[PDB]
Each structure stands twice: as structure tokens, then as C-alpha cells.
Amino acid sequence: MIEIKDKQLTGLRFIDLFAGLGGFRLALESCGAECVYSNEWDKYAQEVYEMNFGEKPEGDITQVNEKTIPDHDILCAGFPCQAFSISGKQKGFEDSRGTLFFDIARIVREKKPKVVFMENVKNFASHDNGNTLEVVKNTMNELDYSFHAKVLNALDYGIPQKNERIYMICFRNDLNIQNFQFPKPFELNTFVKDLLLPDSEVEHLVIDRKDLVMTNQEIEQTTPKTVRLGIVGKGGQGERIYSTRGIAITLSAYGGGIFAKTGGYLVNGKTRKLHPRECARVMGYPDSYKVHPSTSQAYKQFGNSVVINVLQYIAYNIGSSLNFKPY
DNA sequence: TGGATGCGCTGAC
DNA sequence: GTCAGCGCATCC
Numbered sequence: 001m002i003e004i005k006d007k008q009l010t011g012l013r014f015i016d017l018f019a020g021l022g023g024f025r026l027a028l029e030s031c032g033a034e035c036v037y038s039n040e041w042d043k044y045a046q047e048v049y050e051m052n053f054g055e056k057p058e059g060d061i062t063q064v065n066e067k068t069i070p071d072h073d074i075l076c077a078g079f080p081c082q083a084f085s086i087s088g089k090q091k092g093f094e095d096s097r098g099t100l101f102f103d104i105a106r107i108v109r110e111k112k113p114k115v116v117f118m119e120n121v122k123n124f125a126s127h128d129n130g131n132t133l134e135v136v137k138n139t140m141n142e143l144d145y146s147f148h149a150k151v152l153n154a155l156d157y158g159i160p161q162k163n164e165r166i167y168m169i170c171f172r173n174d175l176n177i178q179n180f181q182f183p184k185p186f187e188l189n190t191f192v193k194d195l196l197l198p199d200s201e202v203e204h205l206v207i208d209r210k211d212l213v214m215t216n217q218e219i220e221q222t223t224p225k226t227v228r229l230g231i232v233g234k235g236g237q238g239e240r241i242y243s244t245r246g247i248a249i250t251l252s253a254y255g256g257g258i259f260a261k262t263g264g265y266l267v268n269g270k271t272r273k274l275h276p277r278e279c280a281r282v283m284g285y286p287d288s289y290k291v292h293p294s295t296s297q298a299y300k301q302f303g304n305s306v307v308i309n310v311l312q313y314i315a316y317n318i319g320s321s322l323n324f325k326p327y
Numbered sequence: 328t329g330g331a332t333g334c335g336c337t338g339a340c
Numbered sequence: 341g342t343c344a345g346c347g348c349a350t351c352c
């Protein structure tokens with residue numbers, strides 16, 4: 001994550017829904033905002049969240065009386081994506097995990113914050129012939145909010161990640177916000193190789209599969225894209241090896257394959273998956289952030305997470321717009 | 328809502 | 341045809 005000198009969100013309160021690791025919290029706090037509520041029902045996510053912020057998030061949002069939620073200015077919510085991801089079955093709202101957005105609407109309808117900042121996977125934008133995004137848009141409009149949605153690729157904002165997500169920023173209409181803009185892309189100067197840990201700390205992640213098939217030659221020049229170098233097994237998810245001279249493939253929460261949830265990389269002649277600390281780094285997390293003691297849970301958590309830097313630029317722009325109040 | 332890995336199918340070229 | 345995906349069902 002980057003340092004923010006002009007703290008555009010100073011004096012603003014926000015809630016961290018579907019908190020997870022608290023990526024939205026790191027991003028908004030870096031801009032000066034104060035978190036006044038967090039909700040996360042996963043046992044392990046609650047532990048790491050508490051480990052880093054000192055508080056246990058409240059559980060299952062579907063059972064929380066929205067009236068009990070503290071007053072806040074900005075509602076943050078990177079809601080469940082298994083039901084909308086290109087990698088899943090796409091049952092969308094038909095999925096028991098795909099109706100959480102309506103819980104968000106319920107809370108918005110009651111607390112009416114100034115801003116609603118949501119995040120979901122790229123496919124959410126086109127799922128069900130665009131009907132899914134349209135439903136969210138109309139719901140927010142009904143609630144008297146403007147709706148700004150755009151897919152941003154993390155590689156355009158200083159993080160070597162193919163992470164592509166749809167970001168939705170909603171402003172309560174009475175605020176008459178007309179200058180909100182998504183961050184403009186800038187040149188990537190950091191690549192996977194730059195965030196890797198020393199070899200001595202990741203020897204245990206090195207795997208030598210005799211069914212490894214190098215398909216492409218290693219590149220010597222860094223490039224802002226994923227560069228596949230080979231595969232193991234049939235080359236399915238978690239069975240693809242990439243160049244550290246390129247960018248990291250999207251992390252996943254329930255991913256499989258021998259290089260589960262991170263993908264495989266060619267590092268000094270060896271092939272290995274990423275270390276939880278490396279996952280944290282490719283997601284924009286500071287080294288000061290404490291990962292969960294279970295590597296399996298840590299991989300899952302970062303796989304579900306957001307790229308901090310991207311949320312930082314968005315948060316900064318949200319604040320920039322809320323502060324432009326000329327006479 | 329354990330940890331691990333082989334897998335298969337969709338979306339966007 | 342190419343390839344990537346906050347995933348899935350199953351095994352212990």
C-alpha cells in the first residue's frame with residue numbers, strides 16, 4: 001500500500017462489512033477515516049482481523065438488526081463472489097451465497113450513509129447478461145444513490161497483479177456529487193520478482209514435478225502482463241507456472257491444483273507457489289500486517305481479498321469529491 | 328468455517 | 341484455438 005499525505009477522509013466514519021482481512025479498513029484508514037463497525041462470520045477471518053485491528057467482527061450479517069449498526073458516512077463491502085465468478089457455477093442470486101447484496105441494501109436503506117463502496121469480481125459486471133449489475137444499480141438508485149461502476153485492473157495501479165474487479169461507488173443524491181472519477185492508470189514499475197522473499201524462506205514451497213512441461217522460455221525483460229512458462233498435470237487451475245518478470249495471476253479463496261490459490265512461478269530454476277507473505281505483498285498489504293497462523297487459511301483469506309492500493313486511490317477520490325464544496 | 332489437490336467448464340478473446 | 345478464473349466436488 002502507499003502513503004497518503006492529504007487525508008481526504010479525516011473525520012469520516014465507515015463500516016467494514018464482509019471484512020475478511022480488513023483490506024477496506026487499511027485503505028480507508030490510510031486516508032484518515034475511522035472504522036466504527038466490522039462484520040465477518042468466518043472464524044479464522046475473525047481471528048486474523050482481531051490480530052490486526054484488535055476487535056472481533058460481529059458475525060452473520062443476515063441475522064444483524066440493521067438498526068443496531070452504528071451511524072457511518074461510508075459503507076464498505078467486498079461481498080461474496082463465488083456465485084458470480086467466472087471460475088464458479090454462476091448461480092448468482094440463486095446461490096445462498098449470492099444474495100448478500102440485498103443485506104447491504106437493507107443496511108443502506110436504514111443507515112443511509114453518504115457513500116456506499118462495493119467490490120466484486122469482473123464477471124459480476126456481465127453476469128446474467130448484465131442483469132446482475134443492473135439490479136445493483138437500480139437498487140442503489142431506488143435508495144436515492146448515484147451509481148458509478150468500473151472494472152479496474154490492479155496492474156494499472158502499481159501492483160503486479162492481474163486482479164480485475166468491478167468497483168461500485170454510490171453517492172447519496174442530496175450530496176449532489178458530480179466530480180467523482182475512477183483513478184487513472186499509470187505505468188507499472190514493480191513486478192512479481194520484486195516482491196519475492198529470499199529463497200531460504202520458501203524452500204518448503206519448492207516442488208519438483210516430473211510431469212512439468214515448460215512451454216515458453218523465461219523472459220529477461222519485465223512486462224505488465226501474466227507470462228505463462230509451463231504447466232504440470234493437465235494445466236488446469238493451480239497447474240500453470242508463470243514468470244516472475246511478469247505480473248501475478250489472480251489469487252483465489254477455494255482454488256485447487258498443486259499451486260493452489262497462488263499459481264506456480266519459476267524462481268531461480270525452481271518451480272513453487274507463493275508464500276502467504278508474498279500473497280500479502282501482491283495484494284498490496286504492508287509487511288506489518290500479521291498473517292493468520294494457518295497457511296491454508298491465510299491463502300484463502302488473501303485469495304478473497306482486495307488490492308489495497310487500488311482501494312486507496314478510489315478512497316482518495318471519494319474523499320476528493322466529498323470535500324469539493326464551493327460556494 | 329480443516330487441509331490438500333485433481334478437475335472442468337465459462338468468459339473473453 | 342488460447343488461456344485465465346476472490347471456484348467445485350471429493351478425498352482423508
Ligand SMILES: Nc1ncnc2c1ncn2[C@@H]1O[C@H](CSCC[C@H](N)C(=O)O)[C@@H](O)[C@H]1O
Pocket residue numbers: 018019020021022023024039040041042045059060061062078079080081100301304305306
Ligand atoms: N453472511 C455473512 N456474514 C458475514 N460475513 C460473511 C457472510 N458471508 C460471507 N461473509 C464473509 O464475506 C467475505 C467476502 S470476501 C471479502 C474480503 C475483504 N474485502 C478483505 O479485504 O479481505 C468473506 O470473508 C466471508 O467469510
